[PDB]
UniProtKB/Swiss-Prot annotation, chain A:
Locations listed in the record: Nucleus
Organ and tissue specificity: Ubiquitously expressed. Predominantly expressed in adult heart and testis and fetal lung and liver, with barely detectable expression in adult lung, liver, kidney, prostate, and peripheral leukocytes.
Gene name, Swiss-Prot/TrEMBL: ASH2L
Chain ranges of the B30.2/SPRY domain: 2-161
Post-translational modification: Both monomethylated and dimethylated on arginine residues in the C-terminus. Methylation is not required for nuclear localization, nor for MLL complex integrity or maintenance of global histone H3K4me3 levels.
Function: Transcriptional regulator. Component or associated component of some histone methyltransferase complexes which regulates transcription through recruitment of those complexes to gene promoters. Component of the Set1/Ash2 histone methyltransferase (HMT) complex, a complex that specifically methylates 'Lys-4' of histone H3, but not if the neighboring 'Lys-9' residue is already methylated. As part of the MLL1/MLL complex it is involved in methylation and dimethylation at 'Lys-4' of histone H3. May play a role in hematopoiesis.
Domain of life from the UniProt record: Eukaryota
Species this chain originates from: Homo sapiens (Human)
Transmembrane segment boundaries: none
Protein name: Set1/Ash2 histone methyltransferase complex subunit ASH2
Assembly and binders: Interacts with HCFC1. Core component of several methyltransferase-containing complexes including MLL1/MLL, MLL2/3 (also named ASCOM complex) and MLL4/WBP7.
Swiss-Prot record, chain B:
Origin organism lineage: Eukaryota, Metazoa, Chordata, Craniata, Vertebrata
Protein name: Retinoblastoma-binding protein 5
Bias kind Acidic residues: ranges: 1-12
Tissues and organs where the protein is expressed, per its UniProt entry: Ubiquitously expressed.
Full protein: residues contained: 344 to 355 of 538
Location in the cell: Nucleus
Function of the protein: In embryonic stem (ES) cells, plays a crucial role in the differentiation potential, particularly along the neural lineage, regulating gene induction and H3 'Lys-4' methylation at key developmental loci, including that mediated by retinoic acid. Does not affect ES cell self-renewal. Component or associated component of some histone methyltransferase complexes which regulates transcription through recruitment of those complexes to gene promoters. As part of the MLL1/MLL complex, involved in mono-, di- and trimethylation at 'Lys-4' of histone H3.
Recorded superkingdom: Eukaryota
Coiled-coil ranges per UniProt: none
Native source species: Homo sapiens (Human)
In-chain residues carrying the UniProt-annotated modification Phosphoserine: 7
Complex formation: Component of the SET1 complex, at least composed of the catalytic subunit (SETD1A or SETD1B), WDR5, WDR82, RBBP5, ASH2L/ASH2, CXXC1/CFP1, HCFC1 and DPY30. Core component of several methyltransferase-containing complexes including MLL1/MLL, MLL2/3 (also named ASCOM complex) and MLL4/WBP7.
Length: 176, 12
């Protein structure tokens, strides 16, 4: 059993590939969560931005099961996101400075620690700092939210392109 | 005519 983009837990407008590892956005922000979530320990997954045409954008990260599928990631209390445009961090629809932007060809890294809890983002194997600490308790799922026709690919592991050497984690694939 | 923006749901 593999960790994949959930067929049951997605916005209908998103275009999910047959292998359930690739996703294309459609118009206004909408979301897909993975098939498996985490409750304790340190976990990791990667996202590759395959194509990001002009005006398109992504908000990538982690969402609890109640995260609104018809809204960007970071919209409500249930999720925490990292935006392609300006590297902004979002939670409860509040954008805060975090990193510089990301786009086409970039490999983004997603770390979560649920012991003080932490959310950490990586860009091409570079730790971008602690985006959020002492997060809302519950189960967290790898999550993708896309604005317009951009294409992203999710890698749950075990083999990452840029595996972090700075922190201990299990790949999301260990959930499978 | 208004079209949905990337920052549609954002407060800040």
């Amino acid at each position: 059993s593999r960790v994949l983009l959930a067929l049951h837990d997605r916005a209908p407008q998103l275009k999910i590939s047959d292998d359930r590892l690739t996703v294309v956005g459609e118009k206004g922000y909408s979301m897909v969560r993975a098939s498996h979530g985490v409750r304790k320990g340190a976990w990791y997954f990667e996202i590759t931005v395959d194509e990001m045409p002009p005006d398109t954008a992504a908000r990538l990260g982690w969402s609890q099961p109640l995260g609104n599928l018809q809204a960007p990631l970071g919209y409500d209390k249930f999720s925490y996101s990292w935006r392609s445009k300006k590297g902004t961090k979002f939670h409860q629809s509040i954008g805060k400075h975090y990193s510089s932007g990301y786009g086409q060809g970039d490999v983004l890294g997603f770390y979560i620690n649920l012991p003080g809890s932490e959310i950490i983002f990586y860009k091409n194997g570079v730790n971008q700092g602690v985006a959020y600490k002492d997060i809302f308790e519950g189960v967290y799922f790898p999550a993708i939210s896309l604005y317009k026709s951009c294409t992203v690919s999710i890698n749950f592991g075990p083999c990452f392109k840029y595996p972090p050497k700075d922190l201990t984690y299990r790949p999301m694939s260990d959930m499978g | 005519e208004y079209e949905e923006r990337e920052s549609e749901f954002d407060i800040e």
